[PDB]
Amino acid sequence: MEKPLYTAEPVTLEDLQLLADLFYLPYEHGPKGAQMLREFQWLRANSIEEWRSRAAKFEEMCGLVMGMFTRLSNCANRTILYDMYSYVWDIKSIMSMVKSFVQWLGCRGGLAGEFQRLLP
Amino acid sequence: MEKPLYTAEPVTLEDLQLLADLFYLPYEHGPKGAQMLREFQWLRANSSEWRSRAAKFEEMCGLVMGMFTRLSNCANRTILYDMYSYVWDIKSIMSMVKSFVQWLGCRRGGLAGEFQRLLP
Amino acid sequence: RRFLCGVVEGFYGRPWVMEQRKELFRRLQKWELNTYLYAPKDDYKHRMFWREMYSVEEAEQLMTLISAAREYEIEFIYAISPGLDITFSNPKEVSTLKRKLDQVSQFGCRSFALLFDDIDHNMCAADKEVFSSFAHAQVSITNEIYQYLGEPETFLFCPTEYCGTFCYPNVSQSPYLRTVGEKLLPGIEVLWTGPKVVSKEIPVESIEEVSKIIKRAPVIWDNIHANDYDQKRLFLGPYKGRSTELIPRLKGVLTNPNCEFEANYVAIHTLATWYKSNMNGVLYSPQMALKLALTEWLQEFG
Amino acid sequence: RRFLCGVVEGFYGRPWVMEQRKELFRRLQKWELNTYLYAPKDDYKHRMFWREMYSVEEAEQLMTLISAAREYEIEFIYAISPGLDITFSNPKEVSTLKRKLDQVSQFGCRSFALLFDDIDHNMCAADKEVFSSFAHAQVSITNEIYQYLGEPETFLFCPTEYCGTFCYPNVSQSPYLRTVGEKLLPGIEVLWTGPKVVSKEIPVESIEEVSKIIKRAPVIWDNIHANDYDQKRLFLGPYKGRSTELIPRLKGVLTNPNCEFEANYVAIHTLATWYKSNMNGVRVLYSPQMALKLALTEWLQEFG
Numbered sequence: 001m002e003k004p005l006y007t008a009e010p011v012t013l014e015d016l017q018l019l020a021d022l023f024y025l026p027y028e029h030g031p032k033g034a035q036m037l038r039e040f041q042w043l044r045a046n047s048i049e050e051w052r053s054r055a056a057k058f059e060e061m062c063g064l065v066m067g068m069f070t071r072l073s074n075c076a077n078r079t080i081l082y083d084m085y086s087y088v089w090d091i092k093s094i095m096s097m098v099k100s101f102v103q104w105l106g107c108r109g110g111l112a113g114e115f116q117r118l119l120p
Numbered sequence: 121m122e123k124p125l126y127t128a129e130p131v132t133l134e135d136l137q138l139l140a141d142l143f144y145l146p147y148e149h150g151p152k153g154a155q156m157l158r159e160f161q162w163l164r165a166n167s168s169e170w171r172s173r174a175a176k177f178e179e180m181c182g183l184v185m186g187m188f189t190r191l192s193n194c195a196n197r198t199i200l201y202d203m204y205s206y207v208w209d210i211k212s213i214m215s216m217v218k219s220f221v222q223w224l225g226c227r228r229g230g231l232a233g234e235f236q237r238l239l240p
Numbered sequence: 241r242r243f244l245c246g247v248v249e250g251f252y253g254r255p256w257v258m259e260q261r262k263e264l265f266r267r268l269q270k271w272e273l274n275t276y277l278y279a280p281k282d283d284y285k286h287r288m289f290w291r292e293m294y295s296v297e298e299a300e301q302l303m304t305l306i307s308a309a310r311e312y313e314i315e316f317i318y319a320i321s322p323g324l325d326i327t328f329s330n331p332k333e334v335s336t337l338k339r340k341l342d343q344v345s346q347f348g349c350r351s352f353a354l355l356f357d358d359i360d361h362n363m364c365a366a367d368k369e370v371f372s373s374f375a376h377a378q379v380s381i382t383n384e385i386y387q388y389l390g391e392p393e394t395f396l397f398c399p400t401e402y403c404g405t406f407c408y409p410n411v412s413q414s415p416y417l418r419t420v421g422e423k424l425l426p427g428i429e430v431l432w433t434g435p436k437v438v439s440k441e442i443p444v445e446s447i448e449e450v451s452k453i454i455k456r457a458p459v460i461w462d463n464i465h466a467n468d469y470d471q472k473r474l475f476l477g478p479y480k481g482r483s484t485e486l487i488p489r490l491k492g493v494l495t496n497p498n499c500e501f502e503a504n505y506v507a508i509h510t511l512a513t514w515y516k517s518n519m520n521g522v523l524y525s526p527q528m529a530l531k532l533a534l535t536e537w538l539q540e541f542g
Numbered sequence: 543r544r545f546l547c548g549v550v551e552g553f554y555g556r557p558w559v560m561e562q563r564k565e566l567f568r569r570l571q572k573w574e575l576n577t578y579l580y581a582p583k584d585d586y587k588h589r590m591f592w593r594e595m596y597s598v599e600e601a602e603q604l605m606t607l608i609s610a611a612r613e614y615e616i617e618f619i620y621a622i623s624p625g626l627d628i629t630f631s632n633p634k635e636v637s638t639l640k641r642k643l644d645q646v647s648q649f650g651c652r653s654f655a656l657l658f659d660d661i662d663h664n665m666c667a668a669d670k671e672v673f674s675s676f677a678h679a680q681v682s683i684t685n686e687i688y689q690y691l692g693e694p695e696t697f698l699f700c701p702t703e704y705c706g707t708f709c710y711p712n713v714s715q716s717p718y719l720r721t722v723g724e725k726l727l728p729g730i731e732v733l734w735t736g737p738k739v740v741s742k743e744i745p746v747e748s749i750e751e752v753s754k755i756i757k758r759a760p761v762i763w764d765n766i767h768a769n770d771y772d773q774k775r776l777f778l779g780p781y782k783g784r785s786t787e788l789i790p791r792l793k794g795v796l797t798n799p800n801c802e803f804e805a806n807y808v809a810i811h812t813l814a815t816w817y818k819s820n821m822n823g824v825r826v827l828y829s830p831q832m833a834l835k836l837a838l839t840e841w842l843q844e845f846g
């Protein structure tokens with residue numbers, strides 16, 4: 001058996017729909033992202049069998065944010081990706097930490113990041 | 121008597137020295153940077169001498185703004201544009217940090233940041 | 241009826257390039273939008289160094305650009321922001337402003353805009369002597385340029401008090417807006433940003449209030465998708481907060497979008513879906529419009 | 543002696559334009575640096591879709607860049623990252639790489655590199671059959687491509703266990719680095735990113751430890767000033783944490799710097815200053831705060 005060739009899976013409509021909700025409006029969050037913040041707050045607030053299943057689908061929800069980047073990172077037209085890489089790379093990373101945090105709950109940003117961490 | 125024509129104060133070395141201290145190294149804050157951070161942590165705990173430090177903090181905050189102000193107006197827009205994101209974000213975070221210190225004596229960031237905050 | 245619907249490139253930061261601007265027109269044409277307002281806050285020869293005449297190559301590019309706007313059935317509006325260091329009473333200044341726009345007319349541009357947004361509310365000792373209030377001085381030179389240019393069909397004017405917040409005592413009682421509405425020629429259009437800079441909502445009564453004092457339907461400068469104020473924030477959401485019931489009460493909607501050009505697809509597409517839905521004075525769903533935009537976009541990725 | 547000192551465009555994200563690249567060469571030469579490693583993790587032809595040959599304009603642009611590198615007397619090294627989908631056992635694959643590098647050789651490139659960073663330690667069944675270990679696979683292909691190219695002067699190799707915190711089970715006892723140390727050809731220079739991926743300090747001690755197991759002095763791929771991992775951050779600080787005493791114990795230092803090209807002035811200035819300071823010494827000399835004041839000065843004249 002030889003090594004499977006690297007293949008690019010294309011950006012789906014769901015990928016885009018996820019992205020749109022991740023970076024929505026000034027005075028709003030996209031439902032798909034607003035839900036993802038709801039679920040992470042609740043999952044953090046617990047220690048039933050429900051948590052084990054909700055924390056699972058949240059890790060799937062996280063891998064979706066991660067996969068969305070991979071597929072955007074692999075498409076023929078780079079121009080789209082590069083004009084957003086800053087914003088999309090970061091969400092992918094925080095989401096990657098948030099996935100791992102929840103895995104362990106079952107068993108940065110520079111100086112400006114730090115000052116924004118002190119105000120309420 | 122007429123409208124004084126538009127003029128651009130050039131970038132000073134003391135500005136660069138401040139910039140480089142703000143965006144220093146991956147494991148170390150710049151002298152000036154870690155200093156600004158120290159005062160904001162302190163002024164937070166106490167709220168009733170204190171006022172003299174707070175005025176010297178707001179003096180330092182202004183220097184960051186001014187630093188951006190001159191960085192923008194310069195002839196080489198090419199340099200500025202590469203780090204527009206960073207400089208714009210540090211000047212902005214300083215403004216809301218300053219306008220908070222003024223409020224204490226007188227008696228944003230997106231979804232990716234909103235996730236970063238609810239982590240240790 | 242005439243309605244100016246399109247994009248205003250009026251943000252602070254690295255301005256777009258000819259090939260992006262060209263693709264913007266293709267997109268604008270495809271989505272049945274008509275206008276395009278040139279307002280890049282950076283472009284030296286627009287805000288700070290406005291007086292400066294364009295270079296030989298700068299000229300050729302702008303020409304090629306204005307020509308591409310026509311090819312793509314797009315209304316090209318050229319804006320100039322003197323406001324900063326301009327002396328409203330020195331006729332040399334007024335002449336230099338006149339000379340600047342003459343050069344623009346040479347390239348093929350027919351539609352202009354005099355912008356007075358983000359400037360100190362104070363006139364110098366010379367202008368203080370010559371003109372009554374700050375609105376009087378702006379109106380004087382705006383009308384003079386509207387007339388000097390042979391009263392164009394499309395002539396936009398952005399006031400300094402361009403939103404609700406910025407009005408003192410308030411929109412219905414501001415003596416600045418009063419002078420603008422009264423002394424500004426009805427031919428000259430007025431830009432508005434709604435009740436705030438980045439309006440969350442633009443209620444019909446809010447437009448009715450300003451239309452009343454500006455004594456005309458406003459052209460909306462929409463900062464809803466503007467992102468210059470936080471290069472850490474992207475806006476891939478839909479054109480929400482503006483009722484379709486606004487359309488017969490406005491002369492147009494020019495959306496100031498994200499600095500990042502490629503990121504504006506959804507914001508422009510959804511604006512078009514919004515406008516088209518009720519041109520003829522729940523027809524629009526932001527959540528719905530968004531799926532259309534996202535569907536169409538998905539094709540450009542490949 | 544020979545010492546490789548420069549920059550490595552080896553980051554993720556929007557790669558530099560060959561316009562910017564020509565400018566970096568001028569800057570490099572001005573500061574007496576001598577190397578450019580072409581390794582942008584994006585460029586489809588470099589990593590992901592590595593087999594794929596360059597087009598007409600793609601070929602044209604690379605030639606001009608290689609030509610500019612000669613003009614500004616900077617050594618151009620072309621790196622290839624075939625590690626994701628390559629089948630080491632398949633000779634057709636080997637031939638595809640041979641063909642890929644020949645095209646670059648036909649642009650004027652004389653210096654090359656083969657990287658195996660950011661890839662899993664598991665081989666496919668065909669590779670599992672043929673080679674005794676993963677280290678054995680990479681050694682065969684690198685050595686084969688080296689010989690094929692005609693044992694060039696500058697041939698770089700990047701291991702999967704390129705940093706202290708990435709060696710299984712540890713640095714000294716790693717079977718992987720031992721296989722490389724022993725079986726990889728002597729002419730081939732090995733890349734090392736220090737104790738961590740982004741090393742706070744690169745201790746002299748740790749360098750003799752790794753030098754031993756790889757049976758040669760490495761070429762540092764310094765990620766100090768890199769900023770892909772946290773796009774919210776930028777690094778304008780001086781080149782800190784690397785003793786001038788490492789200079790005689792290494793074959794070179796290539797800095798992978800901030801993605802935002804213009805921010806790398808202090809980064810590449812302080813690096814040049816660090817190198818020039820203990821250049822000839824064989825076995826203090828460099829002050830970072832002093833190096834930085836010198837950089838910020840030479841930088842300030844770009845603004846105006």
Ligand SMILES: CC(=O)N[C@H]1/C(=N/OC(=O)Nc2ccccc2)O[C@H](CO)[C@@H](O)[C@@H]1O
Pocket residue numbers: 250251252281357358398402433437438461463466467468469496
């Ligand atoms: C007419 C108008 O809106 N003008 C400017 C304008 N001027 O005032 C500001 O810069 N205001 C502001 C910024 C962020 C949030 C609230 C107000 O609004 C936009 C803000 O992004 C700028 O891009 C425009 O150039």
Ligand SMILES: CC(=O)N[C@H]1/C(=N/OC(=O)Nc2ccccc2)O[C@H](CO)[C@@H](O)[C@@H]1O
Pocket residue numbers: 552553554583659660700704735739740763765768769770771798
């Ligand atoms: C040899 C090397 O360092 N390769 C890559 C590399 N590979 O491993 C990682 O991705 N490591 C990692 C990333 C951030 C922080 C800590 C470890 O590190 C750098 C990350 O900035 C990349 O720019 C390089 O392309």
